[model samples]
Target: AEAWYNLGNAYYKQGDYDEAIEYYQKALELDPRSAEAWYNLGNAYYKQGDYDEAIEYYQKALELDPRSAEAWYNLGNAYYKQGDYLKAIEYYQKALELDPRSAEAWYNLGNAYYKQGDYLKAIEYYQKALELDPRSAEAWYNLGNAYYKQGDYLKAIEYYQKALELDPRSAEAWYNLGNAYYKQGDYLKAIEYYQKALELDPRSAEAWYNLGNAYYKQGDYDEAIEYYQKALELDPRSAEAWYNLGNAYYKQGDYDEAIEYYQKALELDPRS
Candidate 1:
């Protein structure tokens, strides 16, 4: 049974989940109370996106070894994937109680709360995760996102800057930093960050749209029109982009073009 469990581990590490499940099941057959085998079987099913079966095996593992923090954490992840943030929080809290130093548990706890729109609680958990792993760029980024959602643009910028310090290549962080600056009415700074994000991900239509907005706010109608056209090429159905393009053309004294764009925008979204 031990040998079978070891074989399961090998196959699991190699990403052969079906083979791993076979060996794990064989081990469990010989020793029905093997919590490790049960947990590994759950992992195999989890990797296969079979969350229901994974939950069943994880529950069995927990029954055999109630103190298994990893099992609790994985169970939390399964619930999270199933969009049950409340259940995910319960298991993540249990996992944290067993392993207080687990940065992953803290981070995931933050994620669950973030998904539930509890930004304050998410910030607290993200701070805990940062305390354990200061170099975690994702934690810093998520902290920024939570602050952004709460309308604390300055605080969001601080966290985003920290995230960029750790991972300068993160396009989403750059884009979000741009949004933070834009919200604060600093169009130039927002333009700079948006340009940086575009350098990293040229295909980002939202980035193009926001860049156009920043230029429009700065009274640069021609530059704004160019960016809006680029945005429209990427996402032609975006009503807001179309509306903004109309505004840009209106500013440029092109009434006919402005009318065309406004009509298109209205056609796409009558409420706009």
Candidate 2:
């Protein structure tokens, strides 16, 4: 029964939630005291959007093994789905007390606190998660977002850099890092990161527009116009891109081209 339960875990890790559920049910029928089986069945049900069924299995697992940290954590997730924040926190705290080494528990606790508008407590838990798993790019990225929300651009940049170091292919992280650099008056660095983001996600019109702004800040009117043109190519309805392109042209002393682009921009938004 334990071996079958372990096999179900392997299936769950590979995203085969239905197969995992089947194996978990088999494990429960073979050994009714299988707390792990119930916990994992709850996870599979949760993944399949059967939140009520998941909650039932989680409750059963908790009943059999009241101190099972993973069961409590899974229960917390189910309660969170039902929008019961206070109940989620109760189970999450129980899980944390049982297994303080669980970085995922700390991360989820941070998310719970963030939902409650408690930024300071959120940061505290995020920091704890990071301490447990320094290479977690998601943790670093979320920490950067938290710092940005608190108006700490420098700290946000630091955390964003850490995230980029861990996962260079993260286009959103690079874009956010570029924005932080731009806010700090580092236009050249801002352009570098923005271009990196665009390279990773060529379809990102916003990244191209932001790259144009970075070039504009450095008096690179031709480069700004070039990037703005790319932005328009990706999203022709981008009014800000057209308006910015017009400004770039105006800065280059091409008033006719500027007027043409400005008219195009105005077509998108008559008020502009």
Candidate 3:
């Protein structure tokens, strides 16, 4: 049993989950009561994106060892990934009850709250997560998102900057920072931040669109047209992009091209 279990562990470490499942099943055949084997089987299923299978194995493990905080936590994750936020929260609270020191459990609980639109509860849980793991860039970024959703751009900017300080390469942080600045009517700063986001994620259509808007705010019709066209290339279906591109052409006194773009925009807008 130990040999099979160890072979399962080796396969799991190698990302050979199918082989790991076979070995774990062999181990279970020999030692049916082994909770770790069941738990590892759950982990393998979870890694394979088979959340239902993972839940089954995890429940088996829990039946044998009810105090396994990791099992409860992972059960929460499976439900979270399946979009059952309320169930995820229940399992997360169970894990927290068993292991109060799990920062990840706290973070997952916060995320469950966030998905349910309880931003205040999410904030409280995220703060607790940050207290346990101060250097977690994701926690900081998610806290910023909660504040951003709550219409507190000032507070969001502070947390987003904190996240960027920890993970400077994150385009998501840069994008949100741009949005916060734009919301505050600081178009120049928004453009600066949005440019950095574009540098990090050039294929982001919305970033290009918003950067075009910022350029338009600065009365730079040429730059606005360029960015809007770039946005349209990535998202040809965006009526807003076509409309704004038309607006830029109109500003530049190109009535024919402006009318063409307006026609395209109107075509995409169903209510028009």
Candidate 4:
């Protein structure tokens, strides 16, 4: 039964939800009170989009072993996916209470708080998460976003830099760092980081668009047009890219081309 339960855990980690459920069910038949089997069965159901069933299994596991922080943490994940933020928060708190060392629970609770627009509480929980796991790049990235939302760009940049230090290949972190610099009017630094982001992900239309913005700030209309065109090439449905292309052409004294791009942009997205 223990081996079957472990097999279920392996399947769950590999994203073979159906196989995991089968093994977990087998384990339960062998040992009815196997908390690990119930917990894994809950995860499998959750991954299979059976949220209500997942909740049932998680509750069963919790009843068998109330001290299982991992069970409570995963239960919170299922609740979160079902848009039950309050219930998610309650489970996360329970998990943390059971295991004060659960950085994942703290981090997820911070995410729950952020989704509800409670930035201050989000930051506080994120800080606690980071304290428990200083190497967590995701924790630093989220902390940066919270600070940026609060208009604390300097602190945001600091956390973003820390995230990059932990994971230098993170294109998302580089792109976000570029945005923080742009907001602070440091266009040159923004351009540098944006270029790095593009180097890591050449197909990133958003990075190309931001690069265009940086070029426009530096009065390089031709470069701006080139980046904007690259963005449009990568994602033809990008109305923002088309609108920026029009702006770039207009600055180059090509009013006709500007008008043409403007029409294209507005056709794709009326808001543009």
Candidate 5:
């Protein structure tokens, strides 16, 4: 049984989840009460994206060893992945009760709350995670996201800056910071951040679209038109991009070009 468990662990480490599950099942067959075997099987299922199976196994593990904070945390993660945020919070709270210092539990609880649109609660949980792991760029980025959702643009920028300090290549952080600055009426700052985000992730059509918006806001119709064209090249079905391109041409007194783009936009999305 121990040998089977060891084999399972080896396969799990190698990311061979099918083999790991097979070995873990063998271990559990020999030692039905082995909480470690159940827990490992749950982990294997979780890695396989079989959250329902993971939850069942983690529940079995918890039944054998109620004190296992790791089992509780894994159960919470399974619920989170299933899009049951409220259920995830219940398991996360249980995990926190067992291990208050668990940074991962705190972070996951924050994400669950964020998914439920409870930005204030998410911020509180994210702050707890940051306290435990100050170097966690993801926690800082999430804090920025929560603040952004709450419409606290200045606070969002501060947290995004911290995230960028830790991970300068974070394209989402750069893009979100651009949005915050844009909301604060700092078009130049928004443009700079959007450009940085594009440098990191050139395939992001939304970034290209927003860059066009910033230039349009600054009355640079020619520059705006160029970015709008890039955005449309990347996402040809974007009605908003087409509409904005039309508006840019209209601003430049090109009525025919404006009408053409407007027709395209209307064709793509009749509601627009």
Candidate 6:
């Protein structure tokens, strides 16, 4: 049992999850009562992307070792992967009941609450996670998103900046920081952050559209048109981008091109 388990772990570390799963099953056949063996089977199957199998083995693990907080948390994760957020929250809370200081559990609980549209509850859980793991960039970034959903742009900006301090390469954080400033009518700051986001992730069509919006707000119609055209090139199906491009063209005194863009927008979305 020990030899098979060690070999399984060795393969697991090498990312050969299929062979590791075969070894784990062999080890389990030899030692059916080994709780950790079942858990490893669960984890290996999880890495194989079968959440249902993950939940099954995790349950057997819990039956053998009811006191395993990690098992409970991982079982919660399998449920979460199935989009059963409410079930995941129950298991996460159960894990917390067993071990209250689990920062990962707290962060995941926050995510479940956010998915359930309880932004305030999500904020409380993220705060708890941050208290436990102050260096958690994801916690800070998600907290910013919750605040952004609640329309508290100032608080969103604060948390997003904190997230950036921890993960300077996060283009999403910069884009959201720009969003917060844009909501607050600070086009200059919005432009700066949007540029940063574009520098990192130039493939983001929304960033291009929003950069155009910032320029349009500052009365730079030509610059807005350029960015808007780039956005359209990337995503021609975006009716809002089409409408905005028409607006930019109208501002530039090009009535024919403006009408052409507006007709495209109308074809895509009747109400636009």
Winning model by lDDT: 1
User: What does candidate 5's lDDT look like per residue over 94-167, in tens digits?
Assistant: 99999999999999999999999999999999999999998988899999999999999999999999999999
What's model 5's overall lDDT? 0.95
Better-scoring candidate (lDDT), 2 or 4 = 4
lDDT of 2 at 266: 94
lDDT of 2 at 270: 94
Off by over 4 Å in 4: 1-20, 26-31
Candidates' RMSD to native: 1.3, 3.4, 1.7, 2.3, 1.1, 1.7
**What is the TM-score of candidate 3?**
0.94
Deviating ranges (above 4 Å) for candidate 5: none
lDDT of 2 by residue, 187-270 (tens): 778888888888899998888888888889789998898899899999999989999999999998999999998999998999
CA lDDT of every candidate: 0.95, 0.89, 0.95, 0.91, 0.95, 0.93
Which tens-of-lDDT digit does each residue in 1-272 have in candidate 1?
99999999999999999999999999989999999999999999999999999999999999999999999999999999999999999999999999999999999999999999999999999999999998988889999999999999999999999999999999989999999998998878889999999999999788898889888889998899999999999999999999999999898889999999999999999973
Tell me the number of clashing residue pairs for each predicted model: 0, 0, 0, 0, 0, 0
TM-score of each: 0.96, 0.79, 0.94, 0.89, 0.97, 0.94
Cα error of candidate 4 at position 40, Å: 2.5
TM-score of 5: 0.97
Off by over 4 Å in 1: none
